[PDB]
Scaffold this active site. Sequence first.
Site, PDB file in Angstrom:
ATOM      1  N   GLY C  67       2.703 -63.409  -8.730  1.00  0.00           N
ATOM      2  CA  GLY C  67       2.459 -62.273  -9.642  1.00  0.00           C
ATOM      3  C   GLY C  67       2.969 -60.930  -9.112  1.00  0.00           C
ATOM      4  N   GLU C 253      -0.948 -53.008  -4.020  1.00  0.00           N
ATOM      5  CA  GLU C 253      -1.770 -52.327  -2.993  1.00  0.00           C
ATOM      6  C   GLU C 253      -0.977 -51.371  -2.119  1.00  0.00           C
ATOM      7  OE1 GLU C 253      -4.287 -56.471  -1.894  1.00  0.00           O
ATOM      8  OE2 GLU C 253      -3.932 -54.945  -0.350  1.00  0.00           O
TER       9      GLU C 253
END
Lengths: 292, 279, 276, 293
Positions: C67, C253
Amino acid sequence: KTKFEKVLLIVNPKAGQGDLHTNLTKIVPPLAAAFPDLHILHTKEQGDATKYCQEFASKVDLIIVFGGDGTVFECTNGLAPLEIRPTLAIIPGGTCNDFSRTLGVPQNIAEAAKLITKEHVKPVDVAKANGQHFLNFWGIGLVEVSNNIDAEEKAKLGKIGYYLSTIRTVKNAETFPVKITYDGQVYEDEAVLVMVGNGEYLGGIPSFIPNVKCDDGTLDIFVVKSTGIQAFKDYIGKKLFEDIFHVKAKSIHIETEEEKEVDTDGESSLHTPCQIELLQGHFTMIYNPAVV
Amino acid sequence: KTKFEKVLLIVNPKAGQGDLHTNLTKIVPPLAAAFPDLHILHTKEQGDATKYCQEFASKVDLIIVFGGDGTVFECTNGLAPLEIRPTLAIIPGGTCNDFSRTLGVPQNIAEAAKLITKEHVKPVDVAKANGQHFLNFWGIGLVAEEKAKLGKIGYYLSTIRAETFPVKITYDQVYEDEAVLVMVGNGEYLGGIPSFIPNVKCDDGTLDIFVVKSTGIQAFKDYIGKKLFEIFHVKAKSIHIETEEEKEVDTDGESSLHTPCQIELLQGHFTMIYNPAVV
Amino acid sequence: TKFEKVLLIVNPKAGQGDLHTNLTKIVPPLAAAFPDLHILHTKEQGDATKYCQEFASKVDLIIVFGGDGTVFECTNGLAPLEIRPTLAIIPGGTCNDFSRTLGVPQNIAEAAKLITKEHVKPVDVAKANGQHFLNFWGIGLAEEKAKLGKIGYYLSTIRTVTFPVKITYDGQVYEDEAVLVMVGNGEYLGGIPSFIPNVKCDDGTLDIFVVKSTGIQAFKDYIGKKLFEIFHVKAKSIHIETEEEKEVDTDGESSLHTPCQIELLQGHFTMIYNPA
Amino acid sequence: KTKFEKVLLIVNPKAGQGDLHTNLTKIVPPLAAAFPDLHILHTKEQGDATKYCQEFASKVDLIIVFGGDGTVFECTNGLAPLEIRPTLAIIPGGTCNDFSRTLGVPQNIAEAAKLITKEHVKPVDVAKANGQHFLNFWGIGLVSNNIDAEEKAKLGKIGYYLSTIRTVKNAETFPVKITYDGQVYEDEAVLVMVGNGEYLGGIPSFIPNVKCDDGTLDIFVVKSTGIQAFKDYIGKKLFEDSNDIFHVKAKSIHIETEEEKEVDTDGESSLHTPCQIELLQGHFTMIYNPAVV
Ligand SMILES: [Mg+2]
Ligand SMILES: [Mg+2]
Ligand SMILES: [Mg+2]
Ligand SMILES: [Mg+2]
């Protein structure tokens, strides 16, 4: 213009009398100046050179070995069985260094290293006896060290070199029956020495088997008959090595009455009977075109 | 618990009848799921599998070959001469696949692939004749395109229903006679069925010598017909075979070996994936 | 073929974690087409980054099955290097924004096949204070949040949900009260075509998009309508200042915050895409 | 009992004045005697050292670079962005070699090679400005004739600046805003530096009390009104604090000018303002001389 994009140098740290830093000062800088991709590996144990050759054979274009007959033999056994075999070069780090002499390599190690930077290459035949490869020789009857002095000289000179240094005084030498088939013909007799030679130097000096070439596509069989011991002693004394049975052949089989232990370029477990073949141009090697 | 941190799969794209995509659907997913570092190389030319084995032997822990007897033989010759030899496994992609049968490998290729994920390993002896290695057999006297399908030894067995020759065999003793067939067997299957040389094991540390005498031609034909495999036959470790003239030798695949031959056994030389359920 | 050697990075949790089944769909087309294929599974966060950095000089194509987060690890792995092989995405998450930008079918078997066609195009990569990205940079942005992604989640809830900002862009300035500030590179954000109009990932500029404090209701309606044609300009060199440090959201992130200098690296990646 | 199973030596063949064979005689034998697995690669073009670092970072335990500030910088840019970063060592092959001096490395190249065999290692902070890493410095405000141009190449950008600052006539002033750990400095300046190296331009840092491993960076600003005092300060070579010169330690720094100004750093680069500057504590491990520290 270079033939060798990547180079491996295998260093036996005990070679050249074991003065490691000084030996590296002599050999590495010429190679590192000339070859902008150079990998240097030291051996640690018996077999390491063989392993390095087998690991790096598909990765580099030139393998240089710094070591004596034994180290060179480990490289011979490493590379000979493989499909892809890069060019091989020798920097002579023992006392005998027979094959380096065959290639015209100066025994000065700095000079040997410089020679490699010239990149002169030629094909070299590799012999095979019952699946065991060699570059210099195969022999029976070359077998006696009493002491450290003798043993130190034997280690210094090598098995063949030592044999030559003492053959003129070897009282009552062991005789044995031998049958040799070579390219459809046969020789059968009582012998004291049987050799098959590929190297142009044996024992540190030109081959006592006459007119051996390492690249002529045939091997040389050389037999000293039981009746020829004195004539051979005298022949070795005179050092005129021109043509005791001696013949050139490509496919050879040697039988004795009992299984006899065989001597070759270095440590091995060969014994008779032996089938001996030649692999023509099997190695490419660095050589000195001025001398050889 | 895994014994194999890195795995190489060598694919002969012509194996399994050449339906490449379909064969890969069967074999690659079980292997890729089980082995998180898996490298897949296709062969293109004869000798490639040998080259791949020699390049990767120091780099991986398991080499899997998808191909027939010939591809397997290329791997045998690749690995056997080396100091470092990783575990070998076979996915049977030819018609005969003798050594895969010796290992109990199912002939269903998806099943053969799954078996490898179980990681059952055993030592296997490798024979060496004048520096030529083999896993199945060495033989002299082994003599339409069904020949390519069945293999040299399978084809010979299919047609055994006249040439004699002198042979001398030294083993550990001596045997000298006129013969029609001389075999040295290491494989438990020859020509796609259990070895006609009785009680061969690939891991018992000895080789089997099997000689059909000139007087035994009819008895051997009948013996092959009956398929009860229980004629000179002896077990030995160190063997030398001489003929009157240089005779061409047949072995696991294409080769240039001929007599005379010194034959040695390298005990436990390979480790190989096998099926412990086949007993 | 343009690709002598190929690496396939597998995140084993991607595609809902049905690993064997997912490999049955993606590996056979690749293995049939690419005769030198190396498959590595990730085990920990950061593995895909490491693999990219180790293999970048060794292979000609890197395919990632994962992903947005796995793709972002590859972006960070490759973008800082001198040698960057072609990259391809097999979409193994729920959002997969950049794969959609490349026209990659969301059917993973079909994505794998597409790679075998070897259609390649240059793709711009953005850089903000040394942090690379492919989709977006933004300020002002639980099972559903994880499924949709930060930007997808924001869009799903904006219809029911202020700060000073200074932006210097190619020598000009914008100063106002804002509720959202975006810099877009991707053609899809949050799983659907970019709400920033006429973004292209390969036109050599970035798109600045600011929703003014007075424009909240108009932006909500704009998002509702999904016709994507308050401030929007194209620029190459961008600096964004707020009154206090504000935390920045991007492809995955990260620890970015304002102030930020943002640059565009034209044609920095080559990538597999769907010309149809 | 070694920390480094595999070693790479990167050689810039033009370093050490370009006497390649003689330089290799000095540096390779000690390394080859001590490290039984040693790979030696020569650079051919700009960028090669960066590429070699990025290719070998996951493969070797030590990378030694033989070259000047520029080659060292290529290695800094090669290794700093990566997840796995082996120990780095420097054999000084330029004229300035600032970071090697920071590490106490003798400028004699045979002695620098021997030092590596001792295997003394320490952590080193690496700075990062808008994603551009550096070891020595970042600066803004930093060649009349052939003499100047020759000396500029010999000394390096920062060494050259120091050799001529006492002559500069009407130096450009510029506005600057610096935010550092929540505080602000705003003024007209002639020089703004952020220092991480203990040596700049071949001599101890003119920014006082810089340490490459103390976890903070040093901001140093010469005010527009302080040009004379800075000239005199450089002349006297007493590099301790004393007053139109602003100097503070900080970890997170942002520097803004009125227009985009070009930035100078350890070597060739395309950085310009505005800049966010961060410090990566202990990011490199490096060979050093604990006797000189
Ligand atoms: Mg000859
Ligand atoms: Mg057996
Ligand atoms: Mg754009
Ligand atoms: Mg500091």
